[PDB]
Design a protein around this nucleic acid. Structure first.
Ligand SMILES: [Mg+2]
Ligand SMILES: [Mg+2]
Ligand SMILES: [Mg+2]
Ligand SMILES: [Mg+2]
Ligand SMILES: [Mg+2]
Ligand SMILES: [Mg+2]
Ligand SMILES: [Mg+2]
Ligand SMILES: [Mg+2]
Ligand SMILES: [Mg+2]
Ligand SMILES: [Mg+2]
Ligand SMILES: [Mg+2]
Ligand SMILES: [Mg+2]
Ligand SMILES: [Mg+2]
Ligand SMILES: [Mg+2]
Ligand SMILES: [Mg+2]
Ligand SMILES: [Mg+2]
Ligand SMILES: [Mg+2]
Ligand SMILES: [Mg+2]
Ligand SMILES: [Mg+2]
Ligand SMILES: [Mg+2]
Ligand SMILES: [Mg+2]
Ligand SMILES: [Mg+2]
Ligand SMILES: [Mg+2]
Ligand SMILES: [Mg+2]
Ligand SMILES: [Mg+2]
Ligand SMILES: [Mg+2]
Ligand SMILES: [Mg+2]
Ligand SMILES: [Mg+2]
Ligand SMILES: [Mg+2]
Ligand SMILES: [Mg+2]
Ligand SMILES: [Mg+2]
Ligand SMILES: [Mg+2]
Ligand SMILES: [Mg+2]
Ligand SMILES: [Mg+2]
Ligand SMILES: [Mg+2]
Ligand SMILES: [Mg+2]
Ligand SMILES: [Mg+2]
Ligand SMILES: [Mg+2]
Ligand SMILES: [Mg+2]
Ligand SMILES: [Mg+2]
Ligand SMILES: [Mg+2]
Ligand SMILES: [Mg+2]
Ligand SMILES: [Mg+2]
Ligand SMILES: [Mg+2]
Ligand SMILES: [Mg+2]
Ligand SMILES: [Mg+2]
Ligand SMILES: [Mg+2]
Ligand SMILES: [Mg+2]
Ligand SMILES: [Mg+2]
Ligand SMILES: [Mg+2]
Ligand SMILES: [Mg+2]
Ligand SMILES: [Mg+2]
Ligand SMILES: [Mg+2]
Ligand SMILES: [Mg+2]
Ligand SMILES: [Mg+2]
Ligand SMILES: [Mg+2]
Ligand SMILES: [Mg+2]
Ligand SMILES: [Mg+2]
Ligand SMILES: [Mg+2]
Ligand SMILES: [Mg+2]
Ligand SMILES: [Mg+2]
Ligand SMILES: [Mg+2]
Ligand SMILES: [Mg+2]
Ligand SMILES: [Mg+2]
Ligand SMILES: [Mg+2]
Ligand SMILES: [Mg+2]
Ligand SMILES: [Mg+2]
Ligand SMILES: [Mg+2]
Ligand SMILES: [Mg+2]
Ligand SMILES: [Mg+2]
Ligand SMILES: [Mg+2]
Ligand SMILES: [Mg+2]
Ligand SMILES: [Mg+2]
Ligand SMILES: [Mg+2]
Ligand SMILES: [Mg+2]
Ligand SMILES: [Mg+2]
Ligand SMILES: [Mg+2]
Ligand SMILES: [Mg+2]
Ligand SMILES: [Mg+2]
Ligand SMILES: [Mg+2]
Ligand SMILES: [Mg+2]
Ligand SMILES: [Mg+2]
Ligand SMILES: [Mg+2]
Ligand SMILES: [Mg+2]
Ligand SMILES: [Mg+2]
Ligand SMILES: [Mg+2]
Ligand SMILES: [Mg+2]
Ligand SMILES: [Mg+2]
Ligand SMILES: [Mg+2]
Ligand SMILES: [Mg+2]
Ligand SMILES: [Mg+2]
Ligand SMILES: [Mg+2]
Ligand SMILES: [Mg+2]
Ligand SMILES: [Mg+2]
Ligand SMILES: [Mg+2]
Ligand SMILES: [Mg+2]
Ligand SMILES: [Mg+2]
Ligand SMILES: [Mg+2]
Ligand SMILES: [Mg+2]
Ligand SMILES: [Zn+2]
Lengths: 62, 100, 84, 208, 99
RNA sequence: UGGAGAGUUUGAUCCUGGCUCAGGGUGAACGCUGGCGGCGUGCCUAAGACAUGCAAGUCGUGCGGGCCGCGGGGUUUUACUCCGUGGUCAGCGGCGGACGGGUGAGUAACGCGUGGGUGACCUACCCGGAAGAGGGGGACAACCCGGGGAAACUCGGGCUAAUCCCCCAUGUGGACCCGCCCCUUGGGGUGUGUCCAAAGGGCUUUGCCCGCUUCCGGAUGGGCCCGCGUCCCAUCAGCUAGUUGGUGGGGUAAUGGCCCACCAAGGCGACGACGGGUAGCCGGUCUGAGAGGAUGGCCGGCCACAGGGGCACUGAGACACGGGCCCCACUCCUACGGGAGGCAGCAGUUAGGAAUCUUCCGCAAUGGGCGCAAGCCUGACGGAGCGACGCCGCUUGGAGGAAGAAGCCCUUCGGGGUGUAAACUCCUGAACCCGGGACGAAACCCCCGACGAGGGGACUGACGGUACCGGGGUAAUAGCGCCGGCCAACUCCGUGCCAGCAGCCGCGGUAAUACGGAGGGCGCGAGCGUUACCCGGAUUCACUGGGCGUAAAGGGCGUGUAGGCGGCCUGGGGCGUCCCAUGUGA
């Protein structure tokens, strides 16, 4: 399964959640990993397409 | 009303019982071509009169036996071994379909 | 016995029965043999009651049996007022 | 809920004044007057030829942005129209116009449909004597829309009601200015308003 | 911990034996008439068939046998006993039969 | 009254052809975000395993007793019966427990759907029609009695009433054999012979009411049978001993090889038997121009199952979810002395899973069971609760407001943008506070009239002080996706085949509208995206509506079986086909 975005927090024994959708570049891979679910977490300091990338909305004011 | 059907006898080889072969024409549900079909019935002859070829009629009746729920109505056109042959060769040709 | 009773329809908090004949062991919204008029118990319309009063007595003839709250809406339809 | 915020950006973008404010969108300066060019950094730049899709798109929004409603509520009416009789399309405007909050704008009780809505929502408006607080009400012929009693006065009505003395209200319309009440008379034929819109395209659009 | 209409079953137990008991008598008596009607004794035979006939219907009123079963019994019975006594026998009594 | 296409094979073209997007749908789930209300909807996986409560009871107008009462029968020293009187615990008997409720495992079959059949059949309670209730005997609980058991209780011993049980009798009337009669598959009529009926309880008691038994009808609900229709693999081509028919029996409400004997050797299959795989079927539902394709979840109709299996009893009715016996698996209790349980009922727990709720309220209403009726039971149902899961409705404001501040973006440093946006000024006013306050409820019953027709009179609202009504009254959450082409929305910066994007075509190699952030823009909005799946587009299984010289596709060539198709004329038949009428199509 493919791990998307920039960096993660996945050693070996790490619970995960599989999505669906190949990569095309990498042959054999046919599934994505959802971010921010179970032991795989969202993308740190990502401001745009946070719906994917399991990134919660940051505070903007203070 | 009780069903009424018309067919040829192909078996007298049961005691006081016979086998009537019924055709029906009708169009194909999707392709509309007008096509035939067949069903065999085990007809009751409590006085084994009717015989091979007897183009006859039969009628839905109370269960005489398993498989057997038609009594014969009346002869219509005796002696039709020509139609019978069709059923015969067809069943014969089956041997040359033996998956060997 | 067969019966005549109130079969609920409509919506939550918006009752709208259908007066009807069926077996006393059918569901109260189950299949029926014949509908005979409606009844909004909330009087939200002029046409808030109706019977085919002929059929009503017909089934009553053969041996139907309405409810303690179905006769009231048939007594209120002269089913019982029996002339002189 | 509804659209809220920058409106004058929309008299433009669509590239055509659509009188969406109170008097401003009627006064020398309706977001277009001064800057009759699309919003944002890329405003005073030469447009490229739109797609046919783009053309149809802009025409739809325009219309909706005029009446100012959700895409939700909007399309139901199209399909409703699309389902009905004969012209089963152009009739659309009739369904749009039967909206309570729409009518109240035409009846000059308010000036912005936005202002109209806040009245209906606050229930300062009545129909046939009924406190009706629902801006989606499809009104019909002979229905009567009047200010309620607790609000017959109110500074906001009087002047808004007053300034109507001037123009011939819609053929399908009527107004006892003193009596604070109006009558939906009929279904506005396509004729009865040449909107700046080509409804033919909205149809074409929605059949994706 | 449970419904006490388990009686409904305990009720069945009596109704079971009661109607079972009568039912054994029916056949053991029905037994007789047949054997006898085969050994010419058309006298003592139609004494039983007459007793047979009563034994059946008397339970038929109740909840044991019902319907055309009594009929189905009695039929095939006197449809048979008589068709035994054809072996001479001599109708010692129409005392069962509308001969 | 209904039909649109685009992207990608080439340097380019036309064609074939496949992949891909734009549409609509869902019992959904997941990510970011989340204000209100309404009406819906919610174990799609383990038909896996379940703690606890509850889901079926009722009548003292069947009967006998317990205790409590109830007053007071009445007393050779705390009562006493005497009913009635209540109510009472059960037992006796009676009706319902076979409906309602859940589930979809199994089932490719008359299970279903549709049209018919039964001279081959049952149908309790309800209604109508005809006649009777003449009398005679007895058992088991209860109570008592001892034994045994830890209990579960259990055996044994002894009395007793009825609508319990038995018998005699009566016979309108019914059944059975043989006859003739008509009719006709065991329908109807009759002749003789022989068999069959029972029940009492309550009184506005001397009259009625609630029940009893036979028969024929009616109506309702069914059982069985029949024709046609109903998935994938022929890489399953042969199948069959109750197998097929007969005769006679057994059995049932009744047909039948349903079972059993005996006799015959038949029965089935390229029109796809037999075998295998999947599946509960339909009304519907989704999509589609349509023809179709897809699907069966909530609602309704039917079938099937009630831990896995088997079996029968009672009964009008079942082989019975919350009845019974047995076997197995599993779990629990116990002085272990041994016994107990069946959530696919309502909630709820666990496990599995990406995922699906309250161990709530009330019989007020509707419906169902019992009863003369009050009244009783009803996790059916009527409501409430939880979840943006869906649809719908509504709010986070409105008018004003600059040649248009600040900050932030670009900048050819002239300026442009965000932007009437804000601020700010007026106005209204979601929420919240006060008051009032439902509809849903009219009958059962009660009065007069005969408790009938009738008028009339009376009790009861779980939801709930809820909606709604009045007044007062506050400017009061916005998010998500995208902005290379298809496809609507462009610019700085960072990065430098790295980090990364991607539905396809493809972007990244120090000037990236394709990565990452930013400004700006497009698109929806308490929602926005994503994933999975169905239909469309796909005329890409083409009946409507396609092809086979070189694009994938003519059998290497004959002969020929079944099958498909068939020239010119006139008749009869009217099968197909066509019309009308009618029923059915819930
Ligand atoms: Mg992206
Ligand atoms: Mg039923
Ligand atoms: Mg009444
Ligand atoms: Mg039209
Ligand atoms: Mg029985
Ligand atoms: Mg269309
Ligand atoms: Mg090439
Ligand atoms: Mg190229
Ligand atoms: Mg193609
Ligand atoms: Mg193409
Ligand atoms: Mg379309
Ligand atoms: Mg889609
Ligand atoms: Mg709700
Ligand atoms: Mg479960
Ligand atoms: Mg398991
Ligand atoms: Mg328990
Ligand atoms: Mg049941
Ligand atoms: Mg059921
Ligand atoms: Mg359920
Ligand atoms: Mg099969
Ligand atoms: Mg098969
Ligand atoms: Mg007597
Ligand atoms: Mg003892
Ligand atoms: Mg004893
Ligand atoms: Mg006695
Ligand atoms: Mg007698
Ligand atoms: Mg007869
Ligand atoms: Mg009796
Ligand atoms: Mg008494
Ligand atoms: Mg039934
Ligand atoms: Mg045998
Ligand atoms: Mg036989
Ligand atoms: Mg037989
Ligand atoms: Mg039976
Ligand atoms: Mg065939
Ligand atoms: Mg095949
Ligand atoms: Mg199978
Ligand atoms: Mg299944
Ligand atoms: Mg279908
Ligand atoms: Mg449709
Ligand atoms: Mg449609
Ligand atoms: Mg179709
Ligand atoms: Mg189907
Ligand atoms: Mg499903
Ligand atoms: Mg379901
Ligand atoms: Mg259903
Ligand atoms: Mg279970
Ligand atoms: Mg049961
Ligand atoms: Mg069982
Ligand atoms: Mg069953
Ligand atoms: Mg249970
Ligand atoms: Mg449960
Ligand atoms: Mg789990
Ligand atoms: Mg649960
Ligand atoms: Mg629920
Ligand atoms: Mg109730
Ligand atoms: Mg009731
Ligand atoms: Mg009652
Ligand atoms: Mg009482
Ligand atoms: Mg209870
Ligand atoms: Mg309750
Ligand atoms: Mg409920
Ligand atoms: Mg909601
Ligand atoms: Mg969500
Ligand atoms: Mg400016
Ligand atoms: Mg500025
Ligand atoms: Mg403003
Ligand atoms: Mg104010
Ligand atoms: Mg009040
Ligand atoms: Mg009441
Ligand atoms: Mg009255
Ligand atoms: Mg009254
Ligand atoms: Mg209040
Ligand atoms: Mg107020
Ligand atoms: Mg504010
Ligand atoms: Mg303000
Ligand atoms: Mg988008
Ligand atoms: Mg698009
Ligand atoms: Mg573009
Ligand atoms: Mg520069
Ligand atoms: Mg650089
Ligand atoms: Mg750069
Ligand atoms: Mg470069
Ligand atoms: Mg992109
Ligand atoms: Mg970017
Ligand atoms: Mg931005
Ligand atoms: Mg932006
Ligand atoms: Mg074709
Ligand atoms: Mg082709
Ligand atoms: Mg050719
Ligand atoms: Mg080649
Ligand atoms: Mg080729
Ligand atoms: Mg060739
Ligand atoms: Mg050849
Ligand atoms: Mg060859
Ligand atoms: Mg030929
Ligand atoms: Mg020919
Ligand atoms: Mg010809
Ligand atoms: Mg028709
Ligand atoms: Zn403006």
């Amino acid at each position: 399964a493919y791990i998307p975005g920039e960096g993660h927090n996945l050693q070996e024994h790490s619970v995960v959640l599989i999505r669906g959708g190949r990569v095309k570049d990498l042959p054999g891979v046919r599934y994505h990993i959802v971010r921010g679910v179970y032991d795989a977490a969202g993308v740190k300091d990502r401001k745009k397409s946070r719906s994917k990338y399991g990134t919660k909305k940051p505070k903007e004011a203070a | 009303p009780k069903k009424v059907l018309t067919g040829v006898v192909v078996s007298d080889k049961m005691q006081k019982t016979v086998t009537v072969l019924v055709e029906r024409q009708f169009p194909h549900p999707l392709y509309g071509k007008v096509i035939k079909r067949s069903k065999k019935y085990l007809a009751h002859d409590p006085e084994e009169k009717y015989k091979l070829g007897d183009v006859v009629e039969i009628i839905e009746s109370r269960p005489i036996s398993k498989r057997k729920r038609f009594r014969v109505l009346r002869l219509v056109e005796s002696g039709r071994m020509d139609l019978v042959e069709k059923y015969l060769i067809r069943r014969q040709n089956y041997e040359s379909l033996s998956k060997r | 016995m067969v019966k005549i009773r109130l079969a609920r329809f409509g919506s939550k908090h918006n009752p709208h029965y259908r007066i009807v004949v069926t077996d006393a062991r059918r569901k109260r919204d189950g299949k029926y043999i014949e509908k005979i008029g409606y009844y909004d118990p909330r009087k939200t319309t002029p046409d808030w009651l109706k019977v085919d009063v002929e059929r009503a007595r017909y089934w009553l003839s053969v041996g139907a049996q309405p409810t303690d709250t179905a006769r009231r809406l048939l007594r209120q339809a002269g089913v019982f007022r029996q002339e002189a | 809920g509804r659209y809220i915020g920058p409106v004058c950006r929309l008299c433009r973008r669509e590239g055509v004044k659509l009188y969406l404010k109170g008097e401003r969108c009627y006064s020398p300066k309706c977001a277009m007057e001064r800057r009759p060019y699309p919003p944002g950094q890329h405003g005073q730049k030469r447009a490229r030829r739109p797609s046919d899709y783009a053309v149809r798109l802009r025409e739809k929004q325009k219309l909706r942005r005029i009446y100012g409603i959700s895409e939700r509520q909007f399309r139901n009416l199209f399909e409703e129209a699309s389902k009905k009789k004969g012209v089963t399309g152009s009739v659309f405007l009739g369904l749009l116009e039967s909206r309570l909050d729409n009518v109240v704008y035409r009846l000059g009780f308010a000036v912005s449909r936005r202002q109209a809505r806040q009245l209906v929502r606050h229930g300062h408006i009545t129909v046939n004597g009924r406190r009706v607080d629902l801006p989606s009400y499809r009104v019909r012929p002979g229905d009567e829309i009047a200010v309620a009693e607790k609000s017959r006065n109110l500074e906001l009505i009087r002047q808004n009601l007053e300034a109507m003395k001037g123009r011939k209200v819609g053929p399908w319309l009527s107004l006892d200015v003193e009596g604070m009440k109006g009558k939906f008379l009929r279904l506005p034929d396509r004729e009865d308003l040449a909107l700046p819109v080509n409804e033919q395209l909205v149809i074409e659009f929605y059949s994706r | 911990r449970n419904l006490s209409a388990l009686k409904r079953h305990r009720q069945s137990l009596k109704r079971r034996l009661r109607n079972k008991a009568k039912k054994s008598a029916i056949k053991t008596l029905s037994k007789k008439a047949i054997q006898l009607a085969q050994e010419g004794k058309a006298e003592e035979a139609l004494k039983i068939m007459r007793k047979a006939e009563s034994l059946i219907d008397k339970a038929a009123k109740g909840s044991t046998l019902h319907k055309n079963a009594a009929a189905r019994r009695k039929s095939r019975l006197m449809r048979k006993v008589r068709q035994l006594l054809e072996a001479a026998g001599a109708p010692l009594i129409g005392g069962g039969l509308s001969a």
